[PDB]
Amino acid sequence: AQNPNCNIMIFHPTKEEFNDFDKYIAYMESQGAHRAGLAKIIPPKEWKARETYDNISEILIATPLQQVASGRAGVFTQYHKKKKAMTVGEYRHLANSKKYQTPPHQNFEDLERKYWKNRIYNSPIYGADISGSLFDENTKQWNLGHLGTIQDLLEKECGVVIEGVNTPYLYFGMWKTTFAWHTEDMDLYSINYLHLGEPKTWYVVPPEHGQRLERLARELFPGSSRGCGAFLRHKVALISPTVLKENGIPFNRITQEAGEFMVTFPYGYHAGFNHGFNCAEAINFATPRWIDYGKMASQCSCGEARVTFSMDAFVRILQPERYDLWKRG
Numbered sequence: 257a258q259n260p261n262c263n264i265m266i267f268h269p270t271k272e273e274f275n276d277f278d279k280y281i282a283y284m285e286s287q288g289a290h291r292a293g294l295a296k297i298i299p300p301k302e303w304k305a306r307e308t309y310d311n312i313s314e315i316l317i318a319t320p321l322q323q324v325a326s327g328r329a330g331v332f333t334q335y336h337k338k339k340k341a342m343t344v345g346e347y348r349h350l351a352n353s354k355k356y357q358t359p360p361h362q363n364f365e366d367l368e369r370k371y372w373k374n375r376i377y378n379s380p381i382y383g384a385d386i387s388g389s390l391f392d393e394n395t396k397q398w399n400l401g402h403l404g405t406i407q408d409l410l411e412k413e414c415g416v417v418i419e420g421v422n423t424p425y426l427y428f429g430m431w432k433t434t435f436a437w438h439t440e441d442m443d444l445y446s447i448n449y450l451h452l453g454e455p456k457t458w459y460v461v462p463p464e465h466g467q468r469l470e471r472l473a474r475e476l477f478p479g480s481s482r483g484c485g486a487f488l489r490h491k492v493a494l495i496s497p498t499v500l501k502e503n504g505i506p507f508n509r510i511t512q513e514a515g516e517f518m519v520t521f522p523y524g525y526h527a528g529f530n531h532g533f534n535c536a537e538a539i540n541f542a543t544p545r546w547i548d549y550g551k552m553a554s555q556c557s558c559g560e561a562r563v564t565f566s567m568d569a570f571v572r573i574l575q576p577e578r579y580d581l582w583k584r585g
């Protein structure tokens with residue numbers, strides 16, 4: 257079997273290989289990439305997402321979220337406090353201010369150490385989950401607004417014809433902005449392009465070991481676990497690499513830089529943080545291999561994890577038994 261140690265693999269497709277998106281995902285999996293839960297794809301040198309980023313400052317962040325931590329440095333939750341709307345230009349200025357700017361650091365490992373030491377003592381502001389795209393409509397390869405839809409995938413695989421749309425999200429980040437441990441909705445794939453700015457560090461647990469992370473999370477967040485049997489769905493719990501290592505949890509880490517794609521694979525738990533001001537775009541997608549993961553995906557029914565209108569049909573068709581109870585939440 258390929259990639260038995262579940263290492264994060266990095267791919268360098270040629271411009272010809274970059275034409276057929278589905279085919280390249282299948283290729284990566286043939287090499288065992290999915291075993292890690294996460295892969296990096298560096299686009300060919302001939303490719304670009306758009307011409308420039310000089311004109312993005314007027315995009316609105318309608319509901320920036322302040323990420324307020326509780327707990328200890330290595331085991332904490334974050335709750336999201338709504339702030340007043342800002343433009344991207346205003347947000348960038350805020351990110352670069354003394355209060356929020358990345359501290360001096362020697363390299364990525366030094367900054368990673370500073371993040372886990374000091375994250376809880378600050379409350380950075382994240383402009384997450386903004387419907388939109390920054391790919392030029394003329395970019396034909398790996399344009400995250402022009403992928404095949406999950407609804408069409410389900411139809412092709414299962415004959416299933418369903419309502420729903422699937423469009424990309426933009427994210428504007430700053431130092432210490434954090435994505436909590438999660439898998440995607442319905443354990444879908446995701447793809448993330450870092451358009452501009454400072455890096456993003458990722459942590460990931462191999463899909464074959466996801467239940468080990470879940471068990472540790474239940475132990476570390478016992479009240480949350482009693483409240484919901486899928487509380488990681490809430491996307492608020494953080495566990496540091498030190499604590500994961502202490503508890504024998506298999507994981508890997510990698511830093512994504514501007515101009516690079518990351519793909520997360522079905523049931524690949526991931527978490528991480530932004531190094532400084534940046535802009536990313538992401539969307540969920542499916543392949544034939546996803547279908548069995550979708551059938552088995554845990555669900556939050558406590559009501560906290562509120563989700564997109566597209567998810568109804570996925571639960572309805574793939575998980576009819578669970579549908580009524582899920583719909584209640």
Ligand SMILES: CCOC(=O)Cc1nn[nH]n1
Nearest residue numbers: 321336382384434435436
């Ligand atoms: C407000 C919390 O926002 C997030 O966690 C957004 C995010 N999800 N994955 N990377 N960023």
Ligand SMILES: [Cl-]
Nearest residue numbers: 359370371374
């Ligand atoms: Cl710091």
Ligand code: NA
Nearest residue numbers: 262263507508
């Ligand atoms: Na490893």
Ligand code: NI
Nearest residue numbers: 439440446520
């Ligand atoms: Ni994700």
Ligand SMILES: [Zn+2]
Nearest residue numbers: 484556558560
């Ligand atoms: Zn829940």
